[PDB]
Write a protein that binds this ligand. Structure first.
Ligand code: A1IOP
Lengths: 266, 298
């Protein structure tokens, strides 16, 4: 329990509830073994594409991570999915996420518009219902990015600086494109990314996780952190109509595909 | 959807219509929220997706139980437990006789328990008003209508749209605060608590300024001492009349010293000083209802 004595509720009670959510929400790193026609590089191209349409429509990082988790968890319930069906499932996962997270989310015709005609409004309204029903209406998970936000709030309550947040988010966006990340809990993934930009001491102070808890994850993360380090981390951008205090919360897009190639090589 | 027989219409919202129903086979009396999908150009309404999802997570005896979700031909049905009456109807029925203090106390403690659970799950109700609080015949009360409930972590922003009935809206919101906090729900419950004691709305304004002026008339016009930062707020005006705080004997006469205490802590101007739902449960006003637990010093 790294959260300080919370005024609203018990510091440990809030923390334990967050941990019990990860125990109920399940993800599988081998879900593509149920869809033999699909390869792990297909999921990577899809999430990279969703990341770009998020940046285009200035959508929140939480919106992207909701769509990622909806897509990954939905496919774990499905079988023998075809390459052509993936664009619709991803954009419908994003449609649900935008409606849940954004205040004035993009309209259905804009979600159909980004698919260059390969998806229509009726296909997306049919697909969102299949997704929500298959997920048993459990659409309130703790995303990979939500943990990062909690970790930043803890480190500065003892609001936070934006530049550091986007650098750690940039590394998590790369790691999310590899389906093997789904073997490590979302909280572990975030603490491990934060450790690569800080230390074990700060990671334990804001996440409560000991070194043994995140050691396995930090080992797998190591190649991705190097590619991010080799090139230098990005700077905070300004977004029109977006209040500067919330600018770190807007989803961004990079040439992460070739960065993911170099990472798996080493 | 064939196993249900509609008994009667209960109410209607932007989202959908509520009915009392019988599961003809079982005899289970439920509340059905019907949502026509053919009417919405954006599929399942954002608000309906959020309410279904939030209510699956929020399992607490003082929160309405969502029993099932059924998808029919361009219709989405939310099946909930049925409760015979809301707090607004109950308070109007009890306007002459009064509500017995042990029942006021029992209801307030139960409301605070359900609210603490929402807050511990990082959820802001945002619309706590008597008609959204459902009671049963055996003394229970539950929070309901989570259509406007938003989760925090990255605090919920404020906007110019149909939110919490003005009467239960916190003063930081009226004064232009850009972010909601758990303190806005505690403010609503203090208003509801006072309303159970007097059997009339504590602050029944007709505009945002009338609401604010009514709050200032009863609690006194605030300053930097009572509320650090109030004068530097977006909708604050130095021109506001300076009224003095009224004695809580003239605001809530039937309430005791313990009761008057809890109400002042619930209606504190400062969102940072205003009592929490967890802290309110520990207050000496409920000492007869609850028995304290040993705290682990570790
Ligand atoms: C409006 C009439 N009030 S009354 O006359 O005091 N009274 C008759 C029965 C009614 N019960 C329920 N009312 C509502 N009302 C909803 C808004 C019309 C909102 C609060 O969920 N939702 C319920 C009820 N049972 C279960 N759910 C969950 C869907 C209370």
């Amino acid at each position: 329990s790294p959260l300080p004595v919370l005024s609203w509720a018990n510091r440990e009670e809030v923390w334990k509830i967050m941990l019990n959510k990860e125990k109920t929400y399940l993800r599988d790193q081998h879900f593509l073994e149920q869809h033999p026609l699909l390869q792990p590089k297909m999921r990577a191209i899809l999430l990279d594409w969703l990341m770009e349409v998020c940046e285009v429509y200035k959508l929140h990082r939480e919106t992207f991570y909701l769509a990622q988790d909806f897509f990954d968890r939905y496919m774990a319930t499905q079988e023998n999915v075809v390459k052509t069906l993936l664009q619709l499932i991803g954009i419908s996962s994003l449609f649900i996420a935008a409606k849940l997270e954004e205040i004035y989310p993009p309209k259905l015709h804009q979600f159909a518009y980004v698919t260059d005609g390969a998806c229509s409004g009726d296909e997306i309204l049919t697909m969102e219902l299949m997704i929500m029903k298959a997920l048993k209406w459990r659409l309130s998970p703790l995303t990979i990015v939500s943990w990062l936000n909690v970790y930043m709030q803890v480190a500065y309550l003892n609001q936070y600086p934006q530049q550091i947040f986007i650098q750690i988010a940039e590394l998590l966006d790369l790691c999310v494109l590899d389906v093997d990340c789904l073997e490590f809990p979302y909280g572990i993934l975030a603490a491990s990314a934060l450790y690569h930009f800080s230390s074990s001491e700060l990671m334990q102070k804001v996440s409560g996780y000991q070194w043994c808890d995140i050691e396995n994850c930090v080992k797998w993360m190591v190649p991705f952190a190097m590619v991010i380090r080799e090139t230098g981390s990005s700077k905070l951008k300004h977004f029109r109509g977006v209040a500067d205090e919330d600018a770190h919360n807007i989803q961004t897009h990079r040439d992460s595909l070739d960065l993911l190639d170099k990472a798996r090589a080493k | 959807m064939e196993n249900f027989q509609k008994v009667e219409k209960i109410g209607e919202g932007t989202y959908g219509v509520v009915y009392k129903a019988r599961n003809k086979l079982t005899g289970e009396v439920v509340a059905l929220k019907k949502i026509r999908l053919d009417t919405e150009t954006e599929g399942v309404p954002s608000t309906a997706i959020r309410e279904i999802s939030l209510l699956k997570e929020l399992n607490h005896p003082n929160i309405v139980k969502l029993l099932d979700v059924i998808h029919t031909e361009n219709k989405l049905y939310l099946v909930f437990e049925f409760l015979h009456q809301d707090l607004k109807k109950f308070m109007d029925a009890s306007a002459l006789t009064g509500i017995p203090l042990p029942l006021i106390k029992s209801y307030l403690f139960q409301l605070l328990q359900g609210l603490a659970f929402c807050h511990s799950h990082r959820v802001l109700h945002r619309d706590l008003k008597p008609q959204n609080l459902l009671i049963n015949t055996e003394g229970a009360i539950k929070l309901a209508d989570f259509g406007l409930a938003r989760a925090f972590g990255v605090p919920v922003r404020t906007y110019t749209h149909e939110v919490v009935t003005l009467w239960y809206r916190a003063p930081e919101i009226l004064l232009g605060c850009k972010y909601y906090s758990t303190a806005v729900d505690i403010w609503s419950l203090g208003c509801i608590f006072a309303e159970m004691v007097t059997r009339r709305a504590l602050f029944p304004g007709d505009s945002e300024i009338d609401q604010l002026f009514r709050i200032f008339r009863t609690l006194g016009t605030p300053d930097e001492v009572v509320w650090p930062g109030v004068t530097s707020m977006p909708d604050y005006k130095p021109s506001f009349p300076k009224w003095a705080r009224q004695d809580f004997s003239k605001v809530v006469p039937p309430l005791d010293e313990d009761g008057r205490s809890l109400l002042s802590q619930m209606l504190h101007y400062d969102p940072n000083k205003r009592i929490s739902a967890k802290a309110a449960l520990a207050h000496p006003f409920f000492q007869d209802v609850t028995k304290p637990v040993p705290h682990l010093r570790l």
